[PDB]
């Protein structure tokens, strides 16, 4: 977890998360993923859901909800709240 | 002489619920062809009537298959399969062996079917900016009572009048406005009701 | 693969509407049905013992996932086969 | 397909004619006997009278109370049916019906509102209810023709409305009596169309 050393601590959890997302939707061109598509018009279901929620809070430490990504159904609202929710 | 076609008044229906409405017949409507000659007509409040069953037993086409019939030669039953919320209305017991049809029957109150509750007999004395208008309407109000079946009394009657809602569909009870037009002398000189939702009448009064 | 997304019960008991619920409790079966009109089976004497008044199929739509259900999507379906029988929700007495 | 659309609605003093036609569509116009029903508010119906089929020739038969009064004609060309009123009285007012049959009301007309009244239009008089101690509510006396809307809040309340239905004077004129209930200091307002006399109302005990 970056600890607050920039402005950057945002940009940074958000392209972390884009990482994540690209690794849990099958993306091999993890280059790009639609930022203002929501969690489920990229096939993010059940599974692409609960493993990228995994893997959020595994490389970030945290502990998101069961429905984070019914809570955030953007890329852009899901770092968002998890990089307002450093304590 | 008139064949006499009533049929029995205070129907109270249930969504889901099957029911059945019968008719009186004086004379017999069993003409002599072997056919009924009476009909059923559905004023659905709001819109125009509709043409429910002829014949005693034949259904009309738009409506559905529903509405089943038949009868004996005097005796008639309409065999309402089933009450939907839209089935709502007044039925009629129209015959058909002797026009003119100048009466078609006093109706039947066909009610969304529910529970006796207490009517909120609330007496209202007239504002006195109106008793220094040139007239005076006290208001004996009821709410959320059925069946409708009481008048308001004015002691301490006559100059009453009739006022009353359908049913509405949440709450499915009536409510009744006895408007007391009066006269400017006579305001100095109470009303209850006799509804089966009590059994005493409640007395209060301006 | 029904494990991999996590449906299923550790145990192989589908615990419906129990506060243990794991989800499916897969098992293997089968099951088959001679159907006949009533008055078709009546005329020819073949047995009657139970009569399908009505049927119908309902697609959840636009659901939360695939395998995911409809809430609004099984009251038309169980309300379609309940207007094509011409039955009603206070007439079954039991529903498997 | 069928449709019986009527016109001919209108306002009038006893003693007057007014106009009814019945708009027929969908069908040979000559074959059945087109007949008029006249509906009393809020009670029962009464049938006022038919014509026979040119076909069939036969003549106009009446209701008892609309002898040397009301007159019924058709015609095939122009497919119309005609309700002719002449020396209106009082009862008058009600909703009359066009019906598809003489002995047989198959369909049914939507209505239109024929009104016999001596009343003028004016703005209401709209007198509230003072509560005894509860329901708060407020009169709409004195006011014709008859729209009317009456709301509470200025439509901002809506649970435990009661828009009592219209009140018959034997003046011709009308009142309603919209009151809420609800334990508490309300709004209610009542729009005369026609008249353009908005009157906005307080009220407390």
Partial sequence: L???????????????????????????????????????????????????????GAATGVRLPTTTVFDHPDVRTLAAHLTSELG | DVVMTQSPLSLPVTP???????????????????????????????????????????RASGVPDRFSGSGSGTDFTLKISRV???????????????????????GT????KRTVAAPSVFIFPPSDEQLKSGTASVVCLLNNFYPRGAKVQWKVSGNSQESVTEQDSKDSTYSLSSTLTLSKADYEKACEVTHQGLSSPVTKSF | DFSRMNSLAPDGRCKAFSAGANGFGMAEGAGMLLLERLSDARRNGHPVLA????????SDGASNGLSAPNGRAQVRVIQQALAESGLGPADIDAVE | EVQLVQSGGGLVQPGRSLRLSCTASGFTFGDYAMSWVRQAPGKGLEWVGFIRSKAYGGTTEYAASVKGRFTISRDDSKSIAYLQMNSLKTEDTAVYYCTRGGTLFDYWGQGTLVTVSSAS???????????????????????????????????????????????????????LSSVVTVPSTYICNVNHKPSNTKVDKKVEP
């Fill in chain 1, 2 to 56: 970056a600890s607050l050393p920039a402005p950057e601590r945002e940009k940074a959890l958000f392209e972390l998360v884009r990482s994540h997302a690209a690794a849990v939707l099958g993306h091999a061109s993890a280059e790009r993923v639609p930022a203002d598509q929501a969690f489920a018009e990229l096939g993010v279901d059940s599974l692409s859901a609960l493993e990228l929620r995994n893997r959020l």
């Fill in chain 2, 16 to 58: 889901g619920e099957p029911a059945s409405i019968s008719c009186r017949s004086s004379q017999s409507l069993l003409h002599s062809n072997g056919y009924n000659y009476l009909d059923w007509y559905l004023q659905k409040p709001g819109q125009s009537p509709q043409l429910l069953i002829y014949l005693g037993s034949n």
């Fill in chain 2, 84 to 106: 939907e919320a839209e089935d709502v209305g007044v039925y009629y017991c129209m015959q058909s062996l002797q026009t003119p049809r100048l009466t078609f029957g006093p």
């Fill in chain 2, 109 to 112: 109150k066909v009610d969304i």
């Fill in chain 3, 51 to 58: 009569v399908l008044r009505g049927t119908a199929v309902n």
């Fill in chain 4, 121 to 175: 239009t004016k703005g209401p008089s709209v007198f509230p209810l003072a509560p005894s101690s509860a329901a708060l509510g407020c009169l709409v006396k004195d006011y014709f023709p008859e729209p009317v809307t009456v709301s509470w809040n200025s439509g901002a309340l809506t649970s435990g409305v009661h828009t009592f239905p219209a009140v018959l004077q034997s003046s011709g004129l009308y009142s």
